[PDB]
Write a protein that binds this ligand. Structure first.
Ligand code: NA
Lengths: 295, 311
């Protein structure tokens, strides 16, 4: 056997790390100085197509270990995004019910994805407070809470970090998007403990998992530049990524440019957190950057 | 560990469907009947067509048909076009997809993003005219090449050398292989490999009912039979209606958490039919089935929400 699993759950993580030879400022070492390489960590190769499969599964497992979750329990989560899809897949497979709590004016598209994965939906007028109230009514109802759960960070410490170090011992920069901050905090803390002078770079446009002393830089990124980079990535490297990867790529190229102009070697790992599919029903990929920007 | 996205192809997971299998666990009263899902959406562009796409280009290079700034013409608007657009671009070729004017903007939009140029042929003439147009275009110079996925032995060979060996490696106990029939490459290549290496293996095609299309699949009575097709390879063919394909697609994501496209519903319907028969006969079975692509591109089609009649 090489890739035989008894459950979809076991096929989580161990995602490919792929060299971006065209988009890299300098892939080859040569006459004008050392290489500056970009390496995409493809987190859309997870069961539900996003990096949130990692925290989702570890949150549930940690809750089981701590005695919070038991055979017929229900999981409550205030989300309408990748975490809810991830939790819906994982909950169901592990024997739990999942209720997602979201605003009444959440997009039908988001809502319908959750429902197809078997999540029940409760609408709030706020979403977080109402999940916590719902959860408090029943000892068998549990809110995992992605924004404050250390199992989120741990999933990257124990999974994303190690995998990167294993595939890229020469790593000089890790770049990722800042949401719950679990990817940056978990991966960042692991890489700092192992790679001597590694830089941890956030791409964005106090979080409860945040640590003031992990991040070495933070890059803010506008939507036009995010879209621009997302289209560039698919046209030049064949990778069809979501909109947060556009932010991450803009930042990684800025870092790469820095290393190129300073005549230093870089091996920059960048997170591709999901694929472009869920974002099609918008302008991001077809037409004008302005139409996309409005989407 | 990959220098190119092209290298992150194949070696896809095989995952047991413990809930949907007719009987996952052997009992004192009967042996197991297991379903194993081969997840071909874990490829570069999210489908099984990455395999033949890349092999067809490389075989063309081997044969001296393709060189640096050549143009590939393919009469396709589906997954093969997406896959050829990605591979072609990474390998330094231009890709032009020829399709009927009638083609969905949803379909066109995918090919455009990946960098394909699009040529529209007449709606009335369908794919036959699209193919003729591709071929007439390719004839206008020696540097313009049509790969022709319905007749290209590299399509078959990509499964004979990839899909088949991977399956045997992960599932030496395989009794049945089930996949949808489109170009026939998957069935023809995987099926030939498996028949050569696994005594008494059954190769089962899933096809649409005449007149009831299932995306990416072809009924061979209704349609042109691909030149790749060898009828001797199959042990069985199952026709599947649109409603059965859709209900199984939904069932798969609800029960196993795998969000697959509609051809996979048809494959699952056939696999469960083969499984139900093994179970009734008291036979042991390990049934590998292809999950050829993910549900994402199909969600605009109402096939995942609302009533089965509407879908
Ligand atoms: Na509770």
């Amino acid at each position: 056997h090489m890739a035989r699993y008894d459950s979809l759950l076991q096929a989580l993580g161990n995602t490919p790390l792929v060299g971006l030879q065209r988009l890299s400022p300098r892939w080859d070492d040569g006459r004008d100085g050392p290489h500056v390489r970009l390496w995409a960590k493809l987190e859309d190769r997870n069961p539900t197509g996003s990096i949130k499969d990692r925290p989702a599964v570890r949150m549930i497992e940690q809750a089981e270990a701590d005695g919070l979750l038991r055979p017929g329990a229900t999981i409550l989560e205030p989300t309408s995004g990748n975490t809810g899809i991830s939790l819906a897949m994982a909950a169901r497979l592990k024997g739990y019910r999942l209720i997602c709590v979201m605003p009444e004016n959440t997009s039908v598209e988001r809502r319908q994805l959750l429902e197809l994965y078997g999540a029940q939906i409760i609408f709030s007028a706020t979403a977080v407070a109402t999940a916590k109230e719902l959860a408090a009514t029943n000892p068998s109802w549990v809110m995992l809470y992605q924004y404050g759960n250390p199992a989120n960070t741990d999933s990257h410490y124990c999974g994303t970090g190690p995998e990167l170090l294993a595939d890229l011992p020469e790593i000089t920069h890790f770049v990722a998007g800042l949401g719950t901050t679990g990817t940056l905090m978990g991966t960042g803390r692991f890489l700092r403990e192992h790679v001597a002078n590694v830089k941890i770079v956030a791409a964005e446009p106090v979080p409860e998992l945040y640590d003031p002393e992990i991040l070495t830089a933070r890059y803010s990124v506008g939507a036009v530049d995010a879209v621009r980079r997302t289209r560039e990535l698919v046209h030049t490297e064949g990778i069809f990524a979501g909109i947060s990867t556009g932010a991450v790529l803009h930042a990684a190229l800025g870092v790469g440019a820095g290393a190129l102009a300073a005549g230093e070697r870089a091996d920059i790992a960048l997170v591709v957190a999901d694929a472009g599919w869920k974002y099609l029903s918008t302008g991001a990929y077809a037409g004008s950057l302005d139409d996309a920007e409005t989407a």
